[PDB]
Amino acid sequence: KEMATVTKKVYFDIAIGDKKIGRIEIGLFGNDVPKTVENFRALATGEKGFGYKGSKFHRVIKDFMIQGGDFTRGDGTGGKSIYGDRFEDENFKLKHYGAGWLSMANAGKDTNGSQFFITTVQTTWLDGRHVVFGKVLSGMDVVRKIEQTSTHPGDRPKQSVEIVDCGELSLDAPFDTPKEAVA
Questions:
Q1: Which residues are in the PPIase cyclophilin-type domain (predicted)?
Q2: Would you state the torsion angle of the CA atoms of residues 84, 86, 88, 94, taken in this order, to the nearest 10 degrees?
């Protein structure tokens, strides 16, 4: 009701330019959005032969969100799911409760691919249009360091913000986390 169950964990290791920034650890709500979660998890491991490793955060807007996941074109026009190019909006059970929530970028209804964003504020106006599926468990300082990186007009970072490494972590047991902002 006020908690959601993390069932999987993934990590993104971030560099900005040549500087090693650190890790974003992400909990995934596999009992609520299993299809969306499986897509994100598999793209993080690269186990289908393509995925997030080496891709960039291409759209960064202060006091809004940071967006990445376009591993095929790198400019917001690309990316793909593990299911085929696009899949339907699974459900909208989870909301953008505050900073630190993971949600699918899309190109309209039922167009989920691989692009995703991490909120840095409570983006209530995105509720019901973007499928929320995860929450930052650690490394919110890394998220905010990305969020504050200097951008060109059109919100592309001037320095390359790269997911240098990424994958899945072992989770001993699912656990509940509050439906609230990540501090």
A1: 11-168
A2: 110
Q: Which two tokens stand for residue 75?
A: 């400019």
**Are the C-beta atoms of residues 60 and 147 closer than 8 Å to each other?**
yes
94 is catalytic: no
Q: Which of 23, 50, 64, 169 is catalytic?
A: 64
User: Is-catalytic flag, 59?
Assistant: yes
Q: What does the alpha-carbon distance between residue 150 and residue 25 come to, in Å, rounded to a whole number? A: 23
129 in active site: no
Q: How was this structure determined?
A: X-ray
Strand order in the sheet with 19-28: 57-61, 65-68, 116-119, 101-104, 132-138, 19-28, 8-16, 161-169
117 catalytic residue (yes or no): yes
Which amino acid, residue 88? Answer: E
Resolution reached, in Å? 1.9
Q: Which of 12, 40, 41, 67 is catalytic?
A: 67
Closest by CA to 139, choosing from 112, 160, 120, is 120
Task: Confirm whether 67 is a catalytic residue.
Answer: yes
Q: Which one of 41, 58, 59, 96 is the catalytic residue?
A: 59
- Catalytic hit among 29, 57, 117, 133: 117
Active site residue 31: no
